[PDB]
Design a protein around this nucleic acid. Sequence first.
DNA 1: AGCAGAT
DNA 2: ATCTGCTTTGGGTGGGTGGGTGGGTTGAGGCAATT
Lengths: 124, 618, 595
Amino acid sequence: LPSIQLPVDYNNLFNEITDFLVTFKQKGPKYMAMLQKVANRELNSVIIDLDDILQYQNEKFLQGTQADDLVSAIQQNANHFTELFCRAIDNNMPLPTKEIDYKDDVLDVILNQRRLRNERMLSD
Amino acid sequence: AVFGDRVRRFQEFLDTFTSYRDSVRSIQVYNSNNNILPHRIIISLDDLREFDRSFWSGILVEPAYFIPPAEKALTDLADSMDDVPHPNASAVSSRHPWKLSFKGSFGAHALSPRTLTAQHLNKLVSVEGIVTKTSLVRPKLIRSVHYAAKTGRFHYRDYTDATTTLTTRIPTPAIYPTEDTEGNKLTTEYGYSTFIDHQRITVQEMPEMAPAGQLPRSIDVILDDDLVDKTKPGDRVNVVGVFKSLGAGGMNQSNSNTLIGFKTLILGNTVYPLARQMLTDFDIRNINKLSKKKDIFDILSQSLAPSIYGHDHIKKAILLMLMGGVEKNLENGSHLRGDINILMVGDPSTAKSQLLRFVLNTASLAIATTGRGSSGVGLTAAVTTDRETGERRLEAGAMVLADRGVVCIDEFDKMTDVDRVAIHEVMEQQTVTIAKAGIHTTLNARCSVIAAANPVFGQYDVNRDPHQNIALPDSLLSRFDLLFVVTDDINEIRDRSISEHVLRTHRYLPPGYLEGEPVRSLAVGEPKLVTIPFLRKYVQYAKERVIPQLTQEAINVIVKNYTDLRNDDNTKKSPITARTLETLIRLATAHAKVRLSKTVNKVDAKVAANLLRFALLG
Amino acid sequence: DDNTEIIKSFKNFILEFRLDSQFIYRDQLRNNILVKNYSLTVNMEHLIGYNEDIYKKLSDEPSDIIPLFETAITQVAKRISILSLPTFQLILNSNANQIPLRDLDSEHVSKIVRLSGIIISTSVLSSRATYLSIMCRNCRHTTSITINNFNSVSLPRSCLNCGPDPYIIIHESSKFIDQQFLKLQEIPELVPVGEMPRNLTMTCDRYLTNKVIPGTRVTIVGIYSIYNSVAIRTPYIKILGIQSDVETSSIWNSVTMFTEEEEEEFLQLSRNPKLYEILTNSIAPSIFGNEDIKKAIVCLLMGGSKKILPDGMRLRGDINVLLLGDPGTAKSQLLKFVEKVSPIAVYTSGKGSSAAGLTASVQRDPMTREFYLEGGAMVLADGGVVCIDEFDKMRDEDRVAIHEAMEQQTISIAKAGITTVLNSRTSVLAAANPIYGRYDDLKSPGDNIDFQTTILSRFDMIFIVKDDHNEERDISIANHVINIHTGQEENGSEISIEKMKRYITYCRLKCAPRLSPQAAEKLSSNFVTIRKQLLINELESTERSSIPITIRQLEAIIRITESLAKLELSPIAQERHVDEAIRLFQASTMDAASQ
DNA sequence: AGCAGAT
DNA sequence: ATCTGCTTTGGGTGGGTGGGTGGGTTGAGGCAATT
Ligand SMILES: Nc1ncnc2c1ncn2[C@@H]1O[C@H](COP(=O)(O)OP(=O)(O)OP(=O)(O)O)[C@@H](O)[C@H]1O
Ligand SMILES: Nc1ncnc2c1ncn2[C@@H]1O[C@H](COP(=O)(O)OP(=O)(O)OP(=O)(O)O)[C@@H](O)[C@H]1O
Ligand SMILES: [Mg+2]
Ligand SMILES: [Mg+2]
Ligand SMILES: [Zn+2]
């Protein structure tokens, strides 16, 4: 399995994605508000507007801090960026604002019991 | 060792002839400015023969060992030329080497599907024939690029098949690598992988060149990358490629036959059409000068089928049919056709079939069908399965294959009602609707129909009304712009004239032959009667760059003629209708096309009126 | 061990065999290598004469010794042509008794046999391997294999770890040959009682391919063998030689298969002052009278000449003849003779025929599920004559399916995706009966003929044969037939079927006369008079003529003139032929129309 | 490649 | 526990001494019964 040196580094792209999600504004940041709605079980679909990414890139360039071309990278290879964006959102999901019935969900109980079992195993 | 030497020898050839370098540079510049030209170059085998005889002989007789070196040399030259500042990651990962295509003169390798034998395997050949089938285009995996998240480095894998290269290699299954050499997880990067298109076509021997009592044969061809959709069924092509064999051919113990041969086929390098004539400035100026004449219509009409005596008006109608009308579709949805349909009914031996055959030969696109030889499915389309992919699809029929052309139907009255319904639908709507095998679609069939039929009793009877003389439905009859009824009336002067004409025709001898000698290429790349080639050029020019528009004067002429024609005591061989108005407008537009005019004038209306009056009231 | 001795023995036959003062096989080999025909035809009577032991081996185990006689030929060819070349093919000729196709059974397996039959189908050429270059998947070790096509071979199962079947063929370094498949049907007369004719599969190699066409009688020398496709094997014959009475190669390409000595005979025969009489008398020697029909059949066999005008129009060059008449006239016998004299011919009954049976039919391959085209009677008879008997029993649709192939000489198909225009250049000779079985003079001619004017106008000459009871003629016919029943001129008044067929082929491929101006003026005046005669006859009777006279009849007269000229290898047609053509037209078609 | 069997 | 070995998808690179109540389904052509 030989190797090549492509002119793409996913670390700078991941940092750019995180900055775009946490800082972009068009009220508070648009995508942070959408994530807030997602956390409260209101919303179940996050749509990323490439227009917003282009606007953010050009604003960064105008500020002088030029960065990597995110829109072209997404267009040229889009399967990877779904996972990258999902990871970025997972990292920055805000805490819920409205109380919900966690015990009703099967997964919450199952994962709580998994945590308890892991704690018991570690204590041994 | 030898490969590098050959690459150097081909590189020295490309240096000596600068046309290929200039073409490569122009292609690269055009790509940089930008829809996108492929990485292919046409080299003349004659120049290679003049430069180095051994290399030319090797490329013609051992292409496997001589074409890859030349392709690599060309790719190296192109890379040395390239000056793109920033390469996109896809471009860096892309596997797009330059491909080589040939022209010139093949001495004894110019063959046909019938003459290709086992002696020609592993050689560069050129084959001519008709394309009869065409599979669906499916991408083919060549290179895959992966990313190791932990290691932060990309890897790649190269795949090869029996039909993607000229030298035999170990087969590579299409399984994508999942784990790195050290056990890291690998995620495929599709956007950086390389896939190329792939299609398989069948080329059939020309029917007219076949031996006596033998059906034509065919050969399978493969086209990859930029040669994928350069041909459609019913096209005349000249294909250049390498004749190969594949598989184990029964040498594996699984097949117990012991009497089956190897598979064979051609990997194409070039495709050369054999349909549109390229017009020169001299030809265009001659066309215009002729069109300025006041009797151009008569000259062009007479030039059609010089060996058929009489039938002036039918020839004029055939000319107007070759030129066609102007197609208009309205916003509301009404779609007015600009095609002219013609029906000939008459007594036996009146030159109807010969006129059909002449129209078949002259017209740019024309398909031949008869009454008892066709079928409802064979005219519209058939449901079959694709050998390459095993997917359900449709095969175009006679009417669909002749899209934007002409279809000649001989023995129109010998068809069946079930088969007549398909033609009724096609002429009425100009489309084909198909509901079979879970397929719902609408194929476009915009063609002009010229047909010849015989009366019910085999000979037109004046006493009986036209309805009793023709067995076709009235609805089907109303869809023909011009109905010509031709009768063989015995006369002295006419008989002497026709007999003398026939005798003169039968005494022709083609140049290059002796008396009593029964009648039987060099390169691949490449009141006076008007010759047929010039007639074709004229028709192409006129129907390609003229769109006449009506004018109030032609409008007055047409309305007057329609008004007088409909309410007139004299009987008509066909019943007047509002469709006659559309036919009048269509004929006027076509005649305006003949003169190379942007507007329809009084003269065009008066010509259309005279033609329709002759058709209706003799 | 023994193989080298066998090879040495067959090499000494090719180098030591002289019947007088000429080395027949050494000289045959040199002459064949000079024109690039790598083969040697050996007569088995000569081998039985040199050493009978060599014949005993070649006949006891044919598929083991034949491969060792090919290598001997190759070695001798190298010695004779190269001053210090694929394996040479061996073609065999024998005069042993022919085994009937249906008598081949388990007692003849792996033996040399001679048999005759009719070829019904031929396959598209395949490619068989003769020298493979192979490589190993794992260790990449290169090797080669050599194969002879005589089966009792596969890639090595174990390399030379490497798993089973480690070798892959390197195609760009291998060499292949040609292979063809043929279906052989037994002759109609040989078939036993109440049995359908039986087929047999055959395969030929290299220089024995593209030697036959469907529908031609052939004689085959080969090996009756078996190949596995439970404990049964499907038999087949491995051809070692083909002999035919038809020069198919000349017929498909140029003029060939005529020796200068044979060619000289044809010119001498053409120079005969009265060749027309000899040919007329040579057709149906056993049928009394009917001289005009025999002359018409001579003209039909000869054919006219076809022209391709600069504008592209093609003019038919074949002649179509219809025989309408009463029973017992010997129309069917004339058709059965014409089928037997013509180089290519098919005899079909209008009743037992169909539109697809004639022309071509669309068929589906059960394996590939793909439609293909199979030729019918008019394709199988291409370049020859079709004898459609019982023309009146044919259905209206099946008869209508013949118009284009009779006039335009093409078969347009548009069915199951397949869209083409085949070629069918055939002459139709039809026999029919009137409506009432006998031509009844009391009723008008429009009542005795149910054929439409369109189909009738396509026939060049129409013969209305009427049987009149005349005592003198009746006595003559009785004497002739009794002589036939109770009972060889060959003295310049008649030529056998074989010679006549060869002469027809020679004339067709050698001559194509053209009309001179005088003939043109004569034919043109005659056409004007005939058309006037039909009009005077029509004006007299309200009824419209049932036998038409259109331009096709003018072209038919021209074709008859050209055939009469071609009969004598005359490059130009003069008035002496126009007069005969006009006489024949008046004797057949104007005679039919007058009634 | 998954599963079925012999050492 | 390890080494050795067969067979798919569905399709003619298994077949017709396995058949069509084991699935691969439209197109053409011939025949009896219906007209
Ligand atoms: N006006 C003509 N000039 C020259 N040849 C003619 C003319 N009319 C008929 N012919 C001759 O008629 C011959 C055959 O007639 P053709 O097939 O053209 O007639 P058709 O109208 O199609 O007849 P059918 O009703 O039998 O199909 C051709 O060889 C052609 O030479
Ligand atoms: N010179 C002859 N004239 C007529 N018949 C003959 C002659 N010589 C032999 N025959 C007999 O003619 C019979 C063949 O029938 P023939 O071909 O005459 O029928 P046809 O008239 O063409 O057909 P159909 O009676 O069905 O209309 C054979 O029995 C043959 O013996
Ligand atoms: Mg016709
Ligand atoms: Mg008979
Ligand atoms: Zn090995």
